[PDB]
Amino acid sequence: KHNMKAFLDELKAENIKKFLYNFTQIPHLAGTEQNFQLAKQIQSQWKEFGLDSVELAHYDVLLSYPNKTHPNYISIINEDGNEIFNTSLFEPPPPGYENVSDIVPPFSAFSPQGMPEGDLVYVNYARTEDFFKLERDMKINCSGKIVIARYGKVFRGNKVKNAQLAGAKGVILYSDPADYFAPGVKSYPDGWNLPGGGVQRGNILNLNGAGDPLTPGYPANEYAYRRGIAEAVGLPSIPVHPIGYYDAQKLLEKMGGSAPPDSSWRGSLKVPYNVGPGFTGNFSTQKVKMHIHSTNEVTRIYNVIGTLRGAVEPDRYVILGGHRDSWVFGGIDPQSGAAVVHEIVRSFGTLKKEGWRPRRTILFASWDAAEFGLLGSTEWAEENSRLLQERGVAYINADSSIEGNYTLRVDCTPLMYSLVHNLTKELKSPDEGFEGKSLYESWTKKSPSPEFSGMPRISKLGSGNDFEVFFQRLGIASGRARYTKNWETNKFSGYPLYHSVYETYELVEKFYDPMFKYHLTVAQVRGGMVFELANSIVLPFDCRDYAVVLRKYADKIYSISMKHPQEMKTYSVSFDSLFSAVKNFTEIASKFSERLQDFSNPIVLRMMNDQLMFLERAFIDPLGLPDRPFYRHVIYAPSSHNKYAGESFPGIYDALFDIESKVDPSKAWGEVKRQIYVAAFTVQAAAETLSEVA
Amino acid sequence: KHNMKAFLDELKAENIKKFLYNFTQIPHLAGTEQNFQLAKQIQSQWKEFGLDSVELAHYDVLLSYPNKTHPNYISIINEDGNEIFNTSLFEPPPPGYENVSDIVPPFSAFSPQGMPEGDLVYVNYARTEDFFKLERDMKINCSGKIVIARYGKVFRGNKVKNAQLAGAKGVILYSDPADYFAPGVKSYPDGWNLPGGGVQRGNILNLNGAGDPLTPGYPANEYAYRRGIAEAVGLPSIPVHPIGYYDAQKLLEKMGGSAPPDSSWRGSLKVPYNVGPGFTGNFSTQKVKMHIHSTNEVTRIYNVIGTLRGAVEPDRYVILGGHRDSWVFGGIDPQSGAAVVHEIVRSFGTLKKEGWRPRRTILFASWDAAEFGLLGSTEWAEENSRLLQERGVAYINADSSIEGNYTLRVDCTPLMYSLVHNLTKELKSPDEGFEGKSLYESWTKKSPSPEFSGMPRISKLGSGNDFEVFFQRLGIASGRARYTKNWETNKFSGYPLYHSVYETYELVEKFYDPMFKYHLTVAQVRGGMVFELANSIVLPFDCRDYAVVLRKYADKIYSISMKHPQEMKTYSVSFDSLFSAVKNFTEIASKFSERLQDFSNPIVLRMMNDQLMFLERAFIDPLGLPDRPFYRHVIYAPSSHNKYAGESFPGIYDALFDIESKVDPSKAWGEVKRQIYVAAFTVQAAAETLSEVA
Numbered sequence A, B: 001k002h003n004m005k006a007f008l009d010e011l012k013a014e015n016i017k018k019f020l021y022n023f024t025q026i027p028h029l030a031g032t033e034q035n036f037q038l039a040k041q042i043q044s045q046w047k048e049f050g051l052d053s054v055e056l057a058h059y060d061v062l063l064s065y066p067n068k069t070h071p072n073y074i075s076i077i078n079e080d081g082n083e084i085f086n087t088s089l090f091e092p093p094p095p096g097y098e099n100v101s102d103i104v105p106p107f108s109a110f111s112p113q114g115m116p117e118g119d120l121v122y123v124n125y126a127r128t129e130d131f132f133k134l135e136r137d138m139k140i141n142c143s144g145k146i147v148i149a150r151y152g153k154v155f156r157g158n159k160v161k162n163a164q165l166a167g168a169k170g171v172i173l174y175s176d177p178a179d180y181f182a183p184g185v186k187s188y189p190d191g192w193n194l195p196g197g198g199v200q201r202g203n204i205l206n207l208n209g210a211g212d213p214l215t216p217g218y219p220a221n222e223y224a225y226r227r228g229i230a231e232a233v234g235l236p237s238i239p240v241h242p243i244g245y246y247d248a249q250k251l252l253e254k255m256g257g258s259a260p261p262d263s264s265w266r267g268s269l270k271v272p273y274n275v276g277p278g279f280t281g282n283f284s285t286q287k288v289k290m291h292i293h294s295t296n297e298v299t300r301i302y303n304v305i306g307t308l309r310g311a312v313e314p315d316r317y318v319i320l321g322g323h324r325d326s327w328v329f330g331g332i333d334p335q336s337g338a339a340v341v342h343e344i345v346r347s348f349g350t351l352k353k354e355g356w357r358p359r360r361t362i363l364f365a366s367w368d369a370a371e372f373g374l375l376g377s378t379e380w381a382e383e384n385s386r387l388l389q390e391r392g393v394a395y396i397n398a399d400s401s402i403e404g405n406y407t408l409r410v411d412c413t414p415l416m417y418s419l420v421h422n423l424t425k426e427l428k429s430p431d432e433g434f435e436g437k438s439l440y441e442s443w444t445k446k447s448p449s450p451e452f453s454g455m456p457r458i459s460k461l462g463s464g465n466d467f468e469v470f471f472q473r474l475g476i477a478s479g480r481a482r483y484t485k486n487w488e489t490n491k492f493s494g495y496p497l498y499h500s501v502y503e504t505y506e507l508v509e510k511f512y513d514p515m516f517k518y519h520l521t522v523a524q525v526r527g528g529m530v531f532e533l534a535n536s537i538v539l540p541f542d543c544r545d546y547a548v549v550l551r552k553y554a555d556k557i558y559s560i561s562m563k564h565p566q567e568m569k570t571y572s573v574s575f576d577s578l579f580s581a582v583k584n585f586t587e588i589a590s591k592f593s594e595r596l597q598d599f600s601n602p603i604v605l606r607m608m609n610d611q612l613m614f615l616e617r618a619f620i621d622p623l624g625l626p627d628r629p630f631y632r633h634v635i636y637a638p639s640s641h642n643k644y645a646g647e648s649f650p651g652i653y654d655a656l657f658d659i660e661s662k663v664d665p666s667k668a669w670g671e672v673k674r675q676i677y678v679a680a681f682t683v684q685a686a687a688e689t690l691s692e693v694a
């Protein structure tokens, strides 16, 4: 038979290993010739594997690169203006590379140019609450200071936005061993820890879903009209540069002014972690000076788009997508995902060559420029938004398949919870100690649900990856899965060698997944999801699972508001409409489920499949969230404080955030009430899409 | 058989006459008890006629009413402050009414309160070009003046916006006999002309599609959060009041200052039509003083919504809608349309009682508060936007069935051109001299297409009626048809007794349509359209007709730009992308049509029916047009200078309008190029929805 088992058994760990090696021998930086060549290779292989068509979709978007003849670096500068200490111009290459060319040196993509000098202030993780503590509790003023922040906890672009609004004139990001050196394991090449010369690259934009900074709303095609740089979306206004912890030690060791307010501000280096401003007495006249010369430039990028046409519903699309561009070799990010996608295409293509076709169309995508702000997926979605909105069933993401070797991680819409639970019950656990047990069993034991006994944890989708445009802009049911670590407090910090030159094929083969069994497990989960979505007669979504979580989020947002009972009294702030809506959604979703179970009629079926497909769509508000027009889902948006994290009822959440500090409480609470109304209405409207149609 | 002929033959002129009489005995002003009672009556009758369900959908929206104990009026005031002339407090009621209560006196709905006094300036029709002529050519300044304008040519809200931006402190609107008294016919009650005491009511908002001024984007339901009055959408900032031509004569007769610039500024009254400012020498110290005391108030309105469930595709909606509220008796506006809808429901219900059901669901609507800014249709569409966007096939409007007795008038999307031509070829002409000939034949002879021999004229949809939210906001194929006059230059001015107390059942039965044959003809056209849309196996849309008009509009907008060849050279303004897109649309639409003709497969059919249904949808831009977020169709929007008129390529049109006057030509031409890009992209994207799906 040609069934899911046939598809799944065809997948091989050894093939994933071979493709990973193949994709990680040279850098594949977005906008470079090396990455165009890999695009053309993937296009050629996907054709050979059997897909019906495979095309390149290209766009010309704003990218950012260091100046090769004018290196970025940071100095401590004495009173005479002599640079007495300079940060590194590059990371020491790992063994056997040392002669690889075109390794981009560490930089913060999209930093403007500048040479600011000033006194340092240390701002911990540069989170919203870190700046609150500095400004409000310690009365330290960052205006005209250079801030130095440790990576971790939140997306780096949020750090830079927060530094900017505090009045900083520059930001230095660094990797502290507290967050990037796991106790008892050795530095690369002899283990998976970050060495002191290692540095994490990454962009520092605040695009809020816009895609290419110059063309928000529309694809960056050949005739595109572009904003001027001063009106571009999301660009930082102050210079920014990342360094490793050997260099950070030299900048922090001399710091004076106030002590750290408490131990949550202290990293692992042998320094006081004083907040500053400036250095201790003997060095008080020394300053820090940044030298940033990177340039932004419009550059062509290439997505590879493969189609496997559906036999019965060719106008319904199930999309498996992940990016191809990397900062350097991309041994984990993204090639551990891209290799998994390659093997999934190969397995589907094997079935196709034997005469099989899935019920619905499957689209496979190799996105470009994800590292520069999800630009490739976003421009493509902007180009095809009408097709996706009326035909998009689901999007499964496929960035890195591993970030640890402990257990499964799934983040997805509630509509896919039942699909995930069911599929994982049918897959074998790859974990030591769980041989002959299901993946569901190992996952649930290692990552228990906080809410339910005998269930695994599944997180909300945030952002920082290519499902953002499909889920938060277009309202297409989306999910992602990978193997992960057991380091709760580091969830959003990245694995130690994240976006460093040390992220190589050897890292994976030696330390993370020698037998490629975790990669295989993830290929089974992602591929199994795609298979069921593209083949099940009734779409494998359960609207009742959304009803359950909506009630959880409504309790949560009500609890936040109830921290302010006097104001809720004064301004008559009622959550009654939102709970009413959630109750109705629960009642209607229950009845719809009964009909779906109780209904030979392909019209009723497809009518019902359309109701299932358009349910995620119904949570979209065409007016968007306040000042973030591309985050249109009313239930989920990326946290305004941390792009990686999802926030539920974001419009109400942001209206309540720090409300006790607002100067006009009447206005602020009026906006809370407005967002309650919008949320209650959207939940009720979504519920009504599940009612009988006439 | 139960076919279109059965449906059409069941329609009777005599029934339309009886319903019209029934709907026009008392006023049915929005928000009044009389109009709620008629809603409940229609709900009851539609149930009796056979519909599956009939419900009231109610909303609480901002309405506007005179103060009953503090009448609105205008004075000429002498130097002492004595009011030596007062305009009327009411229109002389027509014969047999004179004891009807609750006739709302003439007023401009949504006028703010005020008692401004000043000198008059006469501004012709208060069009954009009239103000250009005054300010630019005659150097007359309206700042702090009261402007007096004649009704006609453009929507009254555009007049008031234009007066406001000219700095007027008040606006007086009046009906000139030149525009509202046809030569050789008598005044009401002895003919269909406007008497000197008659006055045209109407709202003066500039909502640009927003619906209820207090809740843009969301339905005005029970828990709605409302803007404060100062942030409401579309409200005028200066007092406004309408008068008849006996009163206008008294205000204009004393006018001094400059002569009219030319004869296009002269109406038919026996006055000089001097522009002012102020009165001639002897009266120079007299002023004009307005007294406006109307109030805005949130008031419940009721839509009646009837459903006839589809037998095969119940989740596809074909909507026939028209409003029920009137300014006074509504003998033409809207009851001549509402009576036609009532008889259509009765005829469909007759077929249903004999066991028939249409293929798709038909929804019938009796909208409320249309006179106060299309509020009932818009709030309902805001509430149901997700259902309409994913299921809406078409909307056929049904306001007044007559505005003359000369020939047919149709305004619709290009997708319905072929449907209209075909249906009209099968219907009998009601016209004298065309007995035994088709409606197509009489219509084409009396209203020839400007472009094509042997074809009738069909206009673009503008606005000023309840299809606005469905077409320009949601992108649902829409159309309208009625019998019309032969008075080209008056097309947007209204028939003489428009929105006056004289618009009665007697007006229609005696002067417009004694035999109710034109009403019957219109019931056949509107009902026949609904029938074909709800019953044809393949939706009766022809995408090739859109290709033809797109090329016409692209030539037109290019010709406008080419008035500025030096600037197109300087700023490299190319229309090449737009023509390319139109060429591609033409090519793809031709191939799609071949497949639609060449394709027993209900999936392919419905796939193809979805491509047809979503084609109008594809012209929607979710970001809207500049500063008009609710006008989202990129091909058509209501003219920024006249809400009644449709404009094609509106975003490019407005970017080019008066561009020679802009202070920064680089910026202005940059915005023209931006709008070219948006248009080319949207046309290409729409074309791509007709490509093979995979």
Ligand SMILES: *[C@@H]1O[C@H](CO)[C@@H](O[C@@H]2O[C@H](CO)[C@@H](O[C@@H]3O[C@H](CO)[C@@H](O)[C@H](O[C@H]4O[C@H](CO)[C@@H](O)[C@H](O)[C@@H]4O)[C@@H]3O)[C@H](O)[C@H]2NC(C)=O)[C@H](O)[C@H]1NC(C)=O
Residues within 6 Å of the ligand: A577, A578, A580, A581, A584, A680, A681, A684, B222
């Ligand atoms: C969840 O679904 C339920 C339906 O099962 C839905 O119930 C609806 O609630 C609204 C608002 O509560 C009801 O609205 C009432 O409608 C009646 C006419 O049917 C009106 O007379 C009422 O207005 C009077 O009372 C108001 C409240 O005191 C006054 O403010 C007002 O001035 C009037 O005096 C009121 O409009 C509606 O009838 C029911 N519909 C039903 C039962 O079918 C509920 O709204 C859904 N939740 C959400 C968030 O949508």
Ligand SMILES: *[C@@H]1O[C@H](CO)[C@@H](O[C@@H]2O[C@H](CO)[C@@H](O[C@@H]3O[C@H](CO)[C@@H](O)[C@H](O[C@H]4O[C@H](CO)[C@@H](O)[C@H](O)[C@@H]4O)[C@@H]3O)[C@H](O)[C@H]2NC(C)=O)[C@H](O)[C@H]1NC(C)=O
Residues within 6 Å of the ligand: A222, B577, B578, B580, B581, B584, B680, B681, B684
């Ligand atoms: C109407 O449909 C046609 C398809 O039938 C579609 O044609 C496409 O036009 C674009 C833009 O003209 C072509 O884009 C080119 O793509 C090639 C690779 O395929 C690139 O190498 C080209 O870039 C070079 O040349 C440019 C122009 O001089 C330079 O600006 C650039 O820097 C590069 O040097 C260019 O991107 C595209 O290939 C075709 N696609 C086809 C033929 O299938 C057309 O765009 C449609 N119209 C609209 C308005 O969409």
Ligand SMILES: *[C@@H]1O[C@H](CO)[C@@H](O[C@@H]2O[C@H](CO)[C@@H](O)[C@H](O)[C@H]2NC(C)=O)[C@H](O)[C@H]1NC(C)=O
Residues within 6 Å of the ligand: A021, A022, A025, A040, A041, A044, A045
């Ligand atoms: C990655 O694998 C690809 C595909 O096998 C290799 O590309 C092929 O290489 C051979 C030898 O040069 C050529 O003859 C083929 O035409 C190439 N096929 C393509 C591009 O489709 C490539 O060599 C491998 N790269 C590495 C670093 O191992």
Ligand SMILES: *[C@@H]1O[C@H](CO)[C@@H](O[C@@H]2O[C@H](CO)[C@@H](O)[C@H](O)[C@H]2NC(C)=O)[C@H](O)[C@H]1NC(C)=O
Residues within 6 Å of the ligand: A075, A081, A082, A083, A084, A085, A086
């Ligand atoms: C840090 O780098 C700077 C820049 O290369 C060094 O300063 C330069 O040194 C050369 C040779 O002495 C001078 O001629 C340049 O004019 C200096 N450029 C400057 C100050 O911008 C500096 O010596 C380096 N510092 C250390 C500790 O190595």
Ligand SMILES: *[C@@H]1O[C@H](CO)[C@@H](O[C@@H]2O[C@H](CO)[C@@H](O)[C@H](O)[C@H]2NC(C)=O)[C@H](O)[C@H]1NC(C)=O
Residues within 6 Å of the ligand: A418, A419, A422, A539, A540, A541, A542, A597
């Ligand atoms: C996950 O599997 C469960 C158990 O098989 C599925 O639930 C069953 O579905 C069938 C078909 O509708 C029903 O007859 C059973 O009563 C259901 N059992 C339950 C709810 O306990 C469930 O549908 C699957 N989820 C998917 C496919 O998304």
Ligand SMILES: *[C@@H]1O[C@H](CO)[C@@H](O[C@@H]2O[C@H](CO)[C@@H](O)[C@H](O)[C@H]2NC(C)=O)[C@H](O)[C@H]1NC(C)=O
Residues within 6 Å of the ligand: B021, B022, B025, B040, B041, B044, B045
């Ligand atoms: C318009 O027609 C309606 C429906 O025939 C009339 O309302 C009915 O009137 C009779 C007499 O009062 C009642 O017994 C019915 O219950 C009413 N039916 C309804 C409201 O559904 C109404 O009288 C007519 N109005 C005018 C002015 O002729």
Ligand SMILES: *[C@@H]1O[C@H](CO)[C@@H](O[C@@H]2O[C@H](CO)[C@@H](O)[C@H](O)[C@H]2NC(C)=O)[C@H](O)[C@H]1NC(C)=O
Residues within 6 Å of the ligand: B075, B081, B082, B083, B084, B085, B086
């Ligand atoms: C126009 O109407 C105004 C208001 O009714 C009239 O002026 C009023 O006349 C009465 C009786 O003489 C006075 O007591 C009021 O105080 C006046 N009110 C004002 C000036 O606001 C005026 O007489 C009317 N003019 C004409 C020509 O009939």
Ligand SMILES: *[C@@H]1O[C@H](CO)[C@@H](O[C@@H]2O[C@H](CO)[C@@H](O)[C@H](O)[C@H]2NC(C)=O)[C@H](O)[C@H]1NC(C)=O
Residues within 6 Å of the ligand: B418, B419, B422, B539, B540, B541, B542, B597
């Ligand atoms: C209007 O009627 C014309 C003439 O009948 C229809 O065009 C014909 O459609 C049939 C079925 O596709 C074709 O076989 C003929 O070749 C067409 N004749 C032509 C184009 O001259 C047309 O489809 C009708 N329009 C509708 C129903 O919207």
Ligand SMILES: *[C@@H]1O[C@H](CO)[C@@H](O)[C@H](O)[C@H]1NC(C)=O
Residues within 6 Å of the ligand: A067, A068, A069, A070, A293, A295
């Ligand atoms: C790189 O270095 C210097 C900076 O002035 C100069 O040679 C060249 O313009 C730079 N390249 C850029 C800005 O892309």
Ligand SMILES: *[C@@H]1O[C@H](CO)[C@@H](O)[C@H](O)[C@H]1NC(C)=O
Residues within 6 Å of the ligand: A141, A142, A143, A144
């Ligand atoms: C922070 O410092 C700068 C000093 O130039 C000043 O302009 C700003 O107002 C200060 N803010 C506070 C709250 O002290």
Ligand SMILES: *[C@@H]1O[C@H](CO)[C@@H](O)[C@H](O)[C@H]1NC(C)=O
Residues within 6 Å of the ligand: A192, A404, A405, A406, A485, A511, A512
């Ligand atoms: C893999 O798992 C083992 C066993 O828990 C652990 O000691 C090792 O550090 C893990 N490797 C990585 C990279 O997490």
Ligand SMILES: *[C@@H]1O[C@H](CO)[C@@H](O)[C@H](O)[C@H]1NC(C)=O
Residues within 6 Å of the ligand: B067, B068, B069, B070, B293, B295
């Ligand atoms: C109507 O007339 C007067 C205006 O002051 C007053 O009796 C009453 O408040 C008014 N009604 C309103 C404003 O609705």
Ligand SMILES: *[C@@H]1O[C@H](CO)[C@@H](O)[C@H](O)[C@H]1NC(C)=O
Residues within 6 Å of the ligand: B141, B142, B143, B144
């Ligand atoms: C129009 O008149 C007013 C007089 O108060 C003045 O403020 C305004 O600037 C004038 N504009 C022109 C163009 O004369």
Ligand SMILES: *[C@@H]1O[C@H](CO)[C@@H](O)[C@H](O)[C@H]1NC(C)=O
Residues within 6 Å of the ligand: B192, B404, B405, B406, B485, B511, B512
């Ligand atoms: C109806 O038609 C006749 C004949 O052309 C015309 O004289 C009459 O004025 C028309 N009535 C109306 C109200 O247009």
Ligand SMILES: [Ca+2]
Residues within 6 Å of the ligand: A210, A211, A212, A214, A215, A216, A217, A218, A219, A220, A378, A379, A382
């Ligand atoms: Ca873009």
Ligand SMILES: [Ca+2]
Residues within 6 Å of the ligand: B210, B211, B212, B214, B215, B216, B217, B218, B219, B220, B378, B379, B382
């Ligand atoms: Ca509203």
